[PDB]
Structure formats: C-alpha cells, structure tokens
Coordinates of C-alpha atoms and ligand atoms in Angstrom, one line a residue:
X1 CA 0.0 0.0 0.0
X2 CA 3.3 2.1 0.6
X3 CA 2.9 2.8 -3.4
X4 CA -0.1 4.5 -3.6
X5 CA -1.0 10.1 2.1
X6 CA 0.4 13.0 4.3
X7 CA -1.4 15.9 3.3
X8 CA -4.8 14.5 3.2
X9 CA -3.7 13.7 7.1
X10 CA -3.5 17.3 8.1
X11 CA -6.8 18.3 5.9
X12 CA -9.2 16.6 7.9
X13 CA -7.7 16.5 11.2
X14 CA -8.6 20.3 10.2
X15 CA -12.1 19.9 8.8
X16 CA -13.1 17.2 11.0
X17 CA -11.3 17.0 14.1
X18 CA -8.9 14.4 15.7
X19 CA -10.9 12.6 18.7
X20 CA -8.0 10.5 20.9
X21 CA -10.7 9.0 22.9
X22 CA -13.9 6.6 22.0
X23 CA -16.5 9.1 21.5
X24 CA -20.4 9.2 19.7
X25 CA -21.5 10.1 16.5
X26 CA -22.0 5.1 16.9
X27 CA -19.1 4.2 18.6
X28 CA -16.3 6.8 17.0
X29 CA -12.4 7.3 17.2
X30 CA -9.6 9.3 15.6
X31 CA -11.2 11.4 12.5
X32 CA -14.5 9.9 12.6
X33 CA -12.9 6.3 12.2
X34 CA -16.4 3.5 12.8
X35 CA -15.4 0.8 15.1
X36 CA -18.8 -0.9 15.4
X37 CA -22.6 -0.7 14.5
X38 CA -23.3 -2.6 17.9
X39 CA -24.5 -0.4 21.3
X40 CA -21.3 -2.4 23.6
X41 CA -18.8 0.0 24.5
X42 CA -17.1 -4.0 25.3
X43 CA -18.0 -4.2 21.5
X44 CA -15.8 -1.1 20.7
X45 CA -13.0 -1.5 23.1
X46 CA -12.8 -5.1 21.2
X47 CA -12.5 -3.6 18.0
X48 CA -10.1 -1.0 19.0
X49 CA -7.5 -3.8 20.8
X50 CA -7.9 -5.8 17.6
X51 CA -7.1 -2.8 14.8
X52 CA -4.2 -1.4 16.9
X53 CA -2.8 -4.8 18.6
X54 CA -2.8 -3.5 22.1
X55 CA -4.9 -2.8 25.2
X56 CA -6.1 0.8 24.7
X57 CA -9.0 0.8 26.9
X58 CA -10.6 3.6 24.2
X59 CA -7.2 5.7 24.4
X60 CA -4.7 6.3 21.0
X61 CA -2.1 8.6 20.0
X62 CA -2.1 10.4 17.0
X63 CA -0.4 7.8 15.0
X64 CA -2.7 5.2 16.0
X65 CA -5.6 7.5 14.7
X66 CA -3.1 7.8 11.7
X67 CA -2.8 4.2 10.9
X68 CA -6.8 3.7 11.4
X69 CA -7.2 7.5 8.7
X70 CA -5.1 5.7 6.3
X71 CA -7.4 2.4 6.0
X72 CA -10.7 4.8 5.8
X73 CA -8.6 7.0 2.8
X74 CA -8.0 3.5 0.9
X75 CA -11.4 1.9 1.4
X76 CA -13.3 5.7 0.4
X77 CA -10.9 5.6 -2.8
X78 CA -11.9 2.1 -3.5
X79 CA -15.7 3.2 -2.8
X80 CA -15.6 6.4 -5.2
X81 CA -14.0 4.1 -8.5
X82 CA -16.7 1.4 -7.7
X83 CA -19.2 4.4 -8.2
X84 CA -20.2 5.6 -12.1
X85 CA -21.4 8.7 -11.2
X86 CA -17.9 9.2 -9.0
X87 CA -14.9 7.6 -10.7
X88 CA -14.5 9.6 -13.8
X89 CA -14.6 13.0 -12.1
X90 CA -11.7 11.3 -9.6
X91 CA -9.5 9.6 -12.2
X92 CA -9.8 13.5 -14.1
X93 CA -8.3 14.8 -11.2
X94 CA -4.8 16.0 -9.9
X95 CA -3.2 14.7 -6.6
X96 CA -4.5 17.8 -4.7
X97 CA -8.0 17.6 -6.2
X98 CA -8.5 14.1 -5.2
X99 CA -7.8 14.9 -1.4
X100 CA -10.4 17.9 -1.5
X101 CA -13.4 14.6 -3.6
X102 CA -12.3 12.2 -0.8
X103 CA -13.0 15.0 2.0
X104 CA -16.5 15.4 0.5
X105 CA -16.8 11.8 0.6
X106 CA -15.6 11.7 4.2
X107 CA -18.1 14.6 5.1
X108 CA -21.6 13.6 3.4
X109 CA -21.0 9.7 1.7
X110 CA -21.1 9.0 -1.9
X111 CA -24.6 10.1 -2.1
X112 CA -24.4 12.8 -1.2
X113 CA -21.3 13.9 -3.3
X114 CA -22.9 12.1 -6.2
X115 CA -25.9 14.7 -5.7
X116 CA -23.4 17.4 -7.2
X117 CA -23.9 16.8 -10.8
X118 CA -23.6 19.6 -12.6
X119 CA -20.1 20.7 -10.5
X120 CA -18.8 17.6 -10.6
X121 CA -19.0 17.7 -14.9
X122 CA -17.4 21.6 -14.1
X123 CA -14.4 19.7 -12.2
X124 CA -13.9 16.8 -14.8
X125 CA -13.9 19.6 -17.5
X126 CA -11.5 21.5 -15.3
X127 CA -13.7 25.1 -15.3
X128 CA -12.6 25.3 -12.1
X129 CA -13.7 28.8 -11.8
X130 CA -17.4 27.6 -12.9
X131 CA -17.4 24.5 -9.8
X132 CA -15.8 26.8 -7.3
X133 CA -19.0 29.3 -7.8
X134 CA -21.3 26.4 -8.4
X135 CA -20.5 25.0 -5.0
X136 CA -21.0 27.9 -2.8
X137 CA -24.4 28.5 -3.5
X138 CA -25.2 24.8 -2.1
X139 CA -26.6 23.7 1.4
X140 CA -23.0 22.2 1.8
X141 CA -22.0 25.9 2.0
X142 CA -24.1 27.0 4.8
X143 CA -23.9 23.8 7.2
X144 CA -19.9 24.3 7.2
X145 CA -18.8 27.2 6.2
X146 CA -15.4 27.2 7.7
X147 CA -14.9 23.6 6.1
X148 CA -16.7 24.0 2.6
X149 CA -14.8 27.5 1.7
X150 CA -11.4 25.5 2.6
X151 CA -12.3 22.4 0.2
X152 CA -14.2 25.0 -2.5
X153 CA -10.4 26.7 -2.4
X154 CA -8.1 23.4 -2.7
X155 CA -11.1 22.9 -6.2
X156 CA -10.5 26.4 -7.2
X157 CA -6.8 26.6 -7.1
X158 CA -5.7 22.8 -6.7
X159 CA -3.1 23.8 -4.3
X160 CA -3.0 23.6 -0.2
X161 CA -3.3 27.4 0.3
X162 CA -6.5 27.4 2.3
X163 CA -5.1 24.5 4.8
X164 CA -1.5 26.5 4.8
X165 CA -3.1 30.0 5.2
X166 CA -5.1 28.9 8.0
X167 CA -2.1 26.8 10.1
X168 CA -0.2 30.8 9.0
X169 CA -2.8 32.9 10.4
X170 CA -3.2 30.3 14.0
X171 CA 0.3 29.8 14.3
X172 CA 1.6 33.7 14.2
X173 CA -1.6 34.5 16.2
X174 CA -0.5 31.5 18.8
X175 CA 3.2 33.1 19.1
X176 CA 1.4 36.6 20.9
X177 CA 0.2 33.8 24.1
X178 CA 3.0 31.1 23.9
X179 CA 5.1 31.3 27.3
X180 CA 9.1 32.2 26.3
X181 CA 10.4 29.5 29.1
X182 CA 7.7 26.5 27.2
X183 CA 6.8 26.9 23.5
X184 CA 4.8 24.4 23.7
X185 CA 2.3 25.8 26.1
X186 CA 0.4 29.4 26.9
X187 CA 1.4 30.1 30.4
X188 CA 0.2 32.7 32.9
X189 CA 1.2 35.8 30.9
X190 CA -0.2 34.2 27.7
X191 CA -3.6 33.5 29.2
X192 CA -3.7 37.1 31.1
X193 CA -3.1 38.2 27.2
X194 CA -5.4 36.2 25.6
X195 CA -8.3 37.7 27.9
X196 CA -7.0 41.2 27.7
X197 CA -7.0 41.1 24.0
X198 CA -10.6 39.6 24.1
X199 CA -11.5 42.9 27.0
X200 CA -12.4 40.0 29.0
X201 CA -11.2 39.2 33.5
X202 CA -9.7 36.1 33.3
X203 CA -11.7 34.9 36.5
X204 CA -15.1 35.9 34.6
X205 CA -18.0 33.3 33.7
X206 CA -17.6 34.7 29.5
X207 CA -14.2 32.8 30.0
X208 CA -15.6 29.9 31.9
X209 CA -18.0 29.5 28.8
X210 CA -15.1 30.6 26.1
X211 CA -13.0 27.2 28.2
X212 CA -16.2 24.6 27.9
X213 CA -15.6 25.5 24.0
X214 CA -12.4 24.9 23.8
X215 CA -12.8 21.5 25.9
X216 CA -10.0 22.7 28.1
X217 CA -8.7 20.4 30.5
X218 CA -8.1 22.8 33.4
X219 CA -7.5 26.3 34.7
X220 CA -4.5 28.2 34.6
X221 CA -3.6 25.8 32.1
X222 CA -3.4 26.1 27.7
X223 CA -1.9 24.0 25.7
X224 CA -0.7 24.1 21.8
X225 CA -2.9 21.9 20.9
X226 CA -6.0 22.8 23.0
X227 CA -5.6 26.7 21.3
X228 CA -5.4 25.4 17.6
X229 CA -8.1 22.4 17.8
X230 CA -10.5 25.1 19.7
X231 CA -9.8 28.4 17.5
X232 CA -10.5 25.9 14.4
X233 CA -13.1 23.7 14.9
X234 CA -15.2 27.4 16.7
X235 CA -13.9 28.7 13.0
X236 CA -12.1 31.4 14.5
X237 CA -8.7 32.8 12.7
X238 CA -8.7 36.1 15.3
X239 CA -9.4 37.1 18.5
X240 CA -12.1 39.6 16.9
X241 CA -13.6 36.6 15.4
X242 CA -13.8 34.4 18.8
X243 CA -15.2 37.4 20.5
X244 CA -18.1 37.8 17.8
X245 CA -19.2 34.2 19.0
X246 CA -19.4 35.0 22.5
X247 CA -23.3 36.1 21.8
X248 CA -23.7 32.6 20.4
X249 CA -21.8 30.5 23.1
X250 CA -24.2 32.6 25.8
X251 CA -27.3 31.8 23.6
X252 CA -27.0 27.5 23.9
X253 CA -26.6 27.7 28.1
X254 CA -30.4 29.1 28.2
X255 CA -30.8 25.4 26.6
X256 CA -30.7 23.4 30.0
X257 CA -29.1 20.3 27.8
X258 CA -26.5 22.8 26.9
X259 CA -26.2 24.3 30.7
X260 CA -26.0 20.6 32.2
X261 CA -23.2 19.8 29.6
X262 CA -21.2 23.5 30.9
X263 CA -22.4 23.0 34.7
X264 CA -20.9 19.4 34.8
X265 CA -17.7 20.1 32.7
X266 CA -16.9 23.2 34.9
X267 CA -16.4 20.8 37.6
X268 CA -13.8 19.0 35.9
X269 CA -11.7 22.1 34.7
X270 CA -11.7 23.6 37.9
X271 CA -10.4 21.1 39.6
X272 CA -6.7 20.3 40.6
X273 CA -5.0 17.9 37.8
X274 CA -4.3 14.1 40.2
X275 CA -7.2 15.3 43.0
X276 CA -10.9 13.5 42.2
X277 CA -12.4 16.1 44.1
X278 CA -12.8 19.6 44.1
X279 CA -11.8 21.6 47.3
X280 CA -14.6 23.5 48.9
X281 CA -12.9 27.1 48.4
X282 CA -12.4 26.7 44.1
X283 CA -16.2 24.4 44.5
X284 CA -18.0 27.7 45.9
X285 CA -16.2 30.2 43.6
X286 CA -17.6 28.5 40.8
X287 CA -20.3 28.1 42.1
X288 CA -20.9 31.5 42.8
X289 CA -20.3 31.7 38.9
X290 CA -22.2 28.7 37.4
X291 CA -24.9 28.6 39.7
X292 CA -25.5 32.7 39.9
X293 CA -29.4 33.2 39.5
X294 CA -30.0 30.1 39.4
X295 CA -30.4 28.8 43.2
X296 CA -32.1 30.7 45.6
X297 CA -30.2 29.2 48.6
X298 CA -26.5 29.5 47.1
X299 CA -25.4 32.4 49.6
X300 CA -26.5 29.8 52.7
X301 CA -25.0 26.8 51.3
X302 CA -21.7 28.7 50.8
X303 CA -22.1 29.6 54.4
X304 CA -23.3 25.8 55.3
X305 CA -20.1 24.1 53.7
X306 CA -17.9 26.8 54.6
X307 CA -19.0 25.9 58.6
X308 CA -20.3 22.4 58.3
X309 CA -18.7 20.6 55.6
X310 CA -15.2 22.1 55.3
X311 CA -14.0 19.6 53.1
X312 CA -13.6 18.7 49.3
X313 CA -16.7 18.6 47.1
X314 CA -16.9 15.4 45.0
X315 CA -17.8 14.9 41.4
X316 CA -21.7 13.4 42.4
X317 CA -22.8 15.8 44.9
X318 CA -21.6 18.6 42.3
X319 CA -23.6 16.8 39.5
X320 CA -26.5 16.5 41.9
X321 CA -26.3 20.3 43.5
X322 CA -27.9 21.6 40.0
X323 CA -31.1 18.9 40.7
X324 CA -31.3 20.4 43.9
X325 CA -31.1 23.6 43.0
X326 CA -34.1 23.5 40.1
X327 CA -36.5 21.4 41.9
X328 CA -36.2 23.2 45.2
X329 CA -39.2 25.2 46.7
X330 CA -38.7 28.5 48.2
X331 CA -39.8 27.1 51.7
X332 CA -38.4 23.6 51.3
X333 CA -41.4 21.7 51.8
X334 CA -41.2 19.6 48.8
X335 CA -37.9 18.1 50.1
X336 CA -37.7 14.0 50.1
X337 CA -35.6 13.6 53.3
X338 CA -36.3 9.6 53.0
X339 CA -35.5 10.7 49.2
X340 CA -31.5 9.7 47.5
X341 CA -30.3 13.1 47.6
X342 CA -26.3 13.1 49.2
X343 CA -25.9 13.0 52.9
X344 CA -24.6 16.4 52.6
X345 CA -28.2 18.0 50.9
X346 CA -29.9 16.0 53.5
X347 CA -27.2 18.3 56.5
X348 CA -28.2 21.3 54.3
X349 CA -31.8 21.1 54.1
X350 CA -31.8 20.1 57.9
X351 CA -29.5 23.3 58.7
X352 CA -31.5 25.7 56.2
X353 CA -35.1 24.8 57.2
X354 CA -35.0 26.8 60.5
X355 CA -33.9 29.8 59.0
X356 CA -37.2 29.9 57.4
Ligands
H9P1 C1 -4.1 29.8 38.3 C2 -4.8 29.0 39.4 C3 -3.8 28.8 40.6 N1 -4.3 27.7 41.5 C4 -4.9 27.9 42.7 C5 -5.3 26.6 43.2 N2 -5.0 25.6 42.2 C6 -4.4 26.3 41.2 C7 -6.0 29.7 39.9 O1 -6.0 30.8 40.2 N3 -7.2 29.0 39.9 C8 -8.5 29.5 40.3 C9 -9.0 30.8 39.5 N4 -9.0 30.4 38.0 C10 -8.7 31.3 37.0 O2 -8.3 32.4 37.3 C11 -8.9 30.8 35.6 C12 -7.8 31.3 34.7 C13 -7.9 30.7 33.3 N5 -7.5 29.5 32.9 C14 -7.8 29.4 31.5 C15 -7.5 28.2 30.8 C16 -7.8 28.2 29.5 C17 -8.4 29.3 28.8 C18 -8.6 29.2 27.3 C19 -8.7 30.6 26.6 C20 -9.9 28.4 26.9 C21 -8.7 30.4 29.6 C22 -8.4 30.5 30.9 S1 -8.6 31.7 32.0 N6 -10.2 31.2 35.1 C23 -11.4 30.4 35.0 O3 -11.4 29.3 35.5 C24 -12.6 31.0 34.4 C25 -13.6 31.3 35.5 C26 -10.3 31.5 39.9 C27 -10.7 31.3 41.4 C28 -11.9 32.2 41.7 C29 -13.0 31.8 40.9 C30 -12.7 32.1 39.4 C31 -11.5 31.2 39.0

C-alpha cells in the first residue's frame, strides 16, 4: 500500500477533528474512524484492541488514529472508483483535487457527493472557476462554512493554500500567548493576554464559557494543541472573530441540555489535575459563577459548607447540586428527606429549614 497520504492527514484532522478517545456520532475514534454498528462499549474497546494490537482501553495517539485514517482514505478511494457517477470525475483529477473529492466523501458519503452533478462535470472539464461558484451556493455551503470555503479553495486553485493559510494565520496568532520558558504551552502571561486582547477578567463566567468550548482540561492551564483544535473547529482565525461568537456560546446555556453539559464540565476544569475532588474554596467560587441566578439558597450553602462541611466537594454531589437547585421550593417543603439526595443536601436542608 506504501505505493499509492500525508497531506490528506493534516486536511481533515482540520475539517473534521482528531478525537484520541472513543466518542459518539456510533461508537467513534480518531477522525471519525467506525469501530462498530453494535450499542457495547465492550464491542468497541474489542474492536479498537484488535485494529491497533494492544490494550487501549478507548485511548490512542495520534499515529494510531493515523494508521486507522489511512485504511478509511484507501477503502473511500476504492468506494468512489466502484461508483459511475464518482470515478470519472476522480480519475480527471490531480493529486490535490482528489484529497479535496475524498474529504466530501468523508463529510456527506457517496450520495451525497454524487448529488453534485452539474459541478462535478465543471471539475472533470477542469472550469474550475465555474465549480468553485457552483459549489458555494449549495446547502453544503451554509452547514460548514469554515470547512466548505477550505475544500471549494483546494477545487478552485488545486493547491494547499486554504489548509497552509489557515495553520499561518493560527500559528503567528498563537506566538502573541505562547510562554518564552515552554513553546509548547500558553502560560500565565499568555492567558492574562489572551483575555485582555478579548476585553475579558480572566476569572469571569464569558471565559468559563469561552474554556467549555475549547474543551480545556483545566485552569490556569493552555496548551498548543487545545488553542489550535479550539480556535478551528469554533472557525475562528482572530481574537475579533472568537469574540463575535461570545453572543452565540451565551445563547446555547439558556438550553438546559447545553447548561447541564457546561455545569458538569466546569467541575472537571476547575479542579486540581491528580485530585478526584474539588476543594470547597475553588467548589463555591464556581459556584458562585455557574450557579448565579439560578439557586435561591446559594449564599447559605456557601455559608453551610464553609461551617459544616469544610471539606472537598466530589464529582456526584456537584452533578446532583444543580437537581437540587431547580427542583427546590422557596420554603423547602417539597424536600424528600427519606428521598436519595447526598448525605450532605440532607445536613443542608436540615441546617436551612429553621432559618425559614
Ligand atoms: C491559576 C490557578 C492557581 N491555582 C490555585 C489553586 N490551584 C491552582 C487559579 O488561580 N485557579 C482559580 C482561578 N481560576 C482562574 O483564574 C482561571 C484562569 C484561566 N484559565 C484558563 C485556561 C484556558 C483558557 C482558554 C482561553 C480556553 C482560559 C483560561 S482563564 N479562570 C477560570 O477558570 C474562568 C472562570 C479563579 C478562582 C476564583 C473563581 C474564578 C476562577
């Protein structure tokens, strides 16, 4: 197979994201490698031991998800020259061209590709003015943006300019945060920066949200990797651009699916990396930012754990807090005591209940 790689590598981790961990589209890994129709995580962690040859346990590096990529490119190629409608247009095309067909392919199936009729004749003629314009004024267009302009590009002018202009504008962009002891990494300074530049405290709940976007691990921390996978797959190339999608971010927590998903994750970011739990000082600073307007008796829990509890906050009774919190009645009276709440609601409500 050596004969017949690297660019195509770099395109869609772009376009489509590198996942390390098994994920859910369908049990998913890598960019959007399949590693079994069945419901079993058992079924997919099979799978996975058996394609790479070790214990993984749902975890791969990035040349893991390269080996799996390569397999997917080959069995897509063999896909599009078993399809009449495909493999005339492909065979047409230069090196560069083909990566941009397969990344359609990869994106919305055969079908959907073979749907394109009229550009795809354009692109087998090579009026590659005439597809480029043709292709923007589909549906393709609208539902990725970011990703359709880049492919539309590599059509247009059969070079990697759109995936090398991109990585340009990221990587000089990246070199304003990076720390000068760790290249690798945006340290204090760099984050301190990065919220200045976007007028925002560092310690404020628009970068709480702006973290849950970026999937960051943890505060105080920012890596490389965790700037360029964010800023891309939010399809931001500026600071200006990031901060236009605030509006949007803020918009999706008034979903409480979408406020569940942040409320949960905030846990896990704020929390020290090799501790399970949180401690009770950083639990009731974010909650004084996560749970603001949102729980009546906030102020006297603070003051309940602070004189009570005194001790680190774990993962359950944060999940469970926001329960409490929305099913709650101003007076208490609809509390289950013989209910499954925490031991430590149970001290609360007990504590609270006197004070009217
Ligand atoms: C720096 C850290 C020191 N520390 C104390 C105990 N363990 C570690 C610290 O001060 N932690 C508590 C702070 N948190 C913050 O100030 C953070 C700072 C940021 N980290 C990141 C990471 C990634 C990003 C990118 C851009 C996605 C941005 C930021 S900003 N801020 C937050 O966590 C947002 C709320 C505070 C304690 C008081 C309550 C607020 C947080």
């Amino acid at each position: 197979l050596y004969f017949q790689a690297m660019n195509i590598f770099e395109m869609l981790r772009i376009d489509e994201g590198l996942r390390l961990k098994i994920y859910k589209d369908y049990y998913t890994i890598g960019i959007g490698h399949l590693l079994t129709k069945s419901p079993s995580l058992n079924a997919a962690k099979s799978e996975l031991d058996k394609a790479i040859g070790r214990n993984t346990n749902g975890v791969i590096t990035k040349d893991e998800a390269e080996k799996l990529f390569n397999q997917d490119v080959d069995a897509a190629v063999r896909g599009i020259l078993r399809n009449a409608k495909l493999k005339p247009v492909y065979d047409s095309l230069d090196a560069v061209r083909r990566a941009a067909l397969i990344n359609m392919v990869f994106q919305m199936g055969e079908t959907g590709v073979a749907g394109f009729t009229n550009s795809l004749r354009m692109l087998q003629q090579k009026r590659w003015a005439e597809a480029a314009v043709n292709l923007a004024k589909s549906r393709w267009y609208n539902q990725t943006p970011n990703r359709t302009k880049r492919v539309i590009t590599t059509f247009a002018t059969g070079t990697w300019d759109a995936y090398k202009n991109l990585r340009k504008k990221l990587e000089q962009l990246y070199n304003r945060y990076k720390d000068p002891q760790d290249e690798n990494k945006i340290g204090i300074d760099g984050i301190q920066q990065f919220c200045d530049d976007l007028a925002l405290d560092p310690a404020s709940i628009s970068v709480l949200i702006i973290a849950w976007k970026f999937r960051a691990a943890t505060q105080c921390e920012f890596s490389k990797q965790e700037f360029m996978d964010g800023m891309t797959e939010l399809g931001c190339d500026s600071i200006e651009k990031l901060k236009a999608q605030i509006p949007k971010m803020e918009q999706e927590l008034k979903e409480p699916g979408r406020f569940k998903d942040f409320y949960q994750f905030t846990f896990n970011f704020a929390k020290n990396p090799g501790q399970k739990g949180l401690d009770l000082e950083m639990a009731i600073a974010y909650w004084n930012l996560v749970l603001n307007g949102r729980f009546k008796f906030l102020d006297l829990w603070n003051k309940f754990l602070l004189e009570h509890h005194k001790r680190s906050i774990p993962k359950d009774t944060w999940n469970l807090l926001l329960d409490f919190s929305t099913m709650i009645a101003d007076d208490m009276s609809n509390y289950d005591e013989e209910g499954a709440w925490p031991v430590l609601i149970d001290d609360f409500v007990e504590f609270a209940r006197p004070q009217i």
